[PDB]
Design a protein around this ligand. Structure first.
Ligand SMILES: [Ca+2]
Ligand SMILES: [Ca+2]
Ligand SMILES: [Ca+2]
Ligand SMILES: [Ca+2]
Lengths: 108, 130, 134
């Protein structure tokens, strides 16, 4: 469990818009998925390192049916970046801290 | 009615498996005979494991071919070591025998593996479940 | 999908090279063909390749197959037969459960304890399974 990570449900979305303020990185994930565990320590560090500039959030695809379908989630982990409620970028699959930081800073 | 995660290595592509599940090849429900020789008589169990690393040598045919590792969630499996004890012939496989097979709806996803044991950076979800 | 593999055999007292064809078809249909000097000697069909191979050696009774899958103490587990289509099996020892380090590819080379019938192999496996009970 990462201290600063928040966990989303279907209610935190209205259709494809996110009801959470600011810049938000969402991981669509599952407890049983190997690739998702590969990046859990990287998401922990980002949540610490970007605090106050980025919210890191997780959407458990085994717990919430509406939202993965709204966004066409086909594989996990899927990382999806939101800004002021709107989706700006998406990346599928585990990745390095270097690649993830480049992904975030290029869109934030 | 407790559910657990288990895993299976298979050469069959996720297009087939997500549609049709894992089917058995026989009617025998005798777990002792399944362990001795699951083809004589052909048994009504599908083999899965609780240890995902045990799937890789099978899915790759000993590092020779690519294949897939499937993850599932089920509540009807039979723990072989639990049933057979010290005389379980291949205890380290950590086998969960699935009577009557595994429905497609209980298969969560798939992750491919090439012959050198390298796997996808992601898992494809079963749309029959998601 | 078609997979091919060359193996060694003893035919008429002389070692020769032979060519195996593995054709995996839908509905779990495994087909095994063996060619020697570009002549098909036999073929067998089953739902896993250890069964195909046992049936093939039964058709070619006078040929010794220098393969792990022919060895008297090798046999697949339920799991290895199921998940690897019989290609991965175990080398077993009386009194000892089979371990991952005992896994073998059935067409890997072997020249010891292979001049034996599939029935002898199956009888030994039953003795092995029984040897695990004290
Ligand atoms: Ca920037
Ligand atoms: Ca449970
Ligand atoms: Ca047959
Ligand atoms: Ca013993």
């Amino acid at each position: 469990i990462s201290d600063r990570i928040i966990h989303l449900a279907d209610a935190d979305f209205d259709a494809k818009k996110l009801n959470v303020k600011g810049a938000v990185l969402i991981e669509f994930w599952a407890e049983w998925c190997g690739p998702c565990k590969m990046i859990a320590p990287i998401l922990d560090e980002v949540s610490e390192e970007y605090a106050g500039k980025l919210t890191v959030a997780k959407l458990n695809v085994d717990d919430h049916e509406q939202t993965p379908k709204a966004h066409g989630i086909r594989g996990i982990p899927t990382l999806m970046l939101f800004k002021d409620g709107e989706k700006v970028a998406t990346q599928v699959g585990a990745l390095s801290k270097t690649q993830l930081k480049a992904f975030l800073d290029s869109h934030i | 009615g407790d559910y657990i995660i288990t895993y299976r290595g298979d050469t069959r592509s996720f297009t087939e498996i997500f549609d049709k599940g894992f089917e058995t090849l026989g009617p025998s429900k005798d777990l002792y005979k399944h362990a001795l020789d699951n083809r004589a008589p052909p048994s009504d169990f599908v083999s899965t494991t609780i240890d995902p690393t045990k799937t890789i040598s099978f899915a790759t045919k000993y590092g020779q071919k690519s294949g897939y590792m499937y993850t599932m969630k089920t509540n009807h499996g039979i723990d072989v070591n639990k049933a057979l004890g010290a005389r379980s012939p291949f205890a380290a496989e950590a086998e969960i025998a699935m009577p009557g097979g595994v429905r497609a709806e209980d298969i969560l996803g798939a992750r491919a593996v090439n012959a050198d044991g390298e796997m996808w950076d992601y898992t494809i979800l079963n749309p029959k479940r998601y | 999908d078609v997979d091919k593999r060359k193996i060694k055999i003893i035919l008429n007292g002389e070692m020769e090279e032979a060519e195996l064809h593995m054709i995996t078809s839908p509905n779990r249909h495994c087909c095994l063909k063996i060619f020697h000097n570009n002549n098909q000697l036999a073929e067998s069909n089953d739902t896993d390749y250890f069964s195909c191979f046992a049936d093939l050696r039964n058709q070619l009774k006078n040929i010794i197959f220098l393969c792990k899958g022919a060895k008297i103490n090798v046999y697949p587990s339920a799991m290895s037969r199921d998940m690897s289509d019989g290609i991965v099996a175990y080398e077993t020892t009386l009194g000892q459960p089979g371990l991952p380090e005992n896994q073998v590819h059935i067409f890997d080379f072997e020249d010891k304890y292979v001049d034996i019938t599939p029935e002898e192999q199956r009888k030994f496996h039953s003795q092995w399974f029984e040897s695990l009970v004290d």
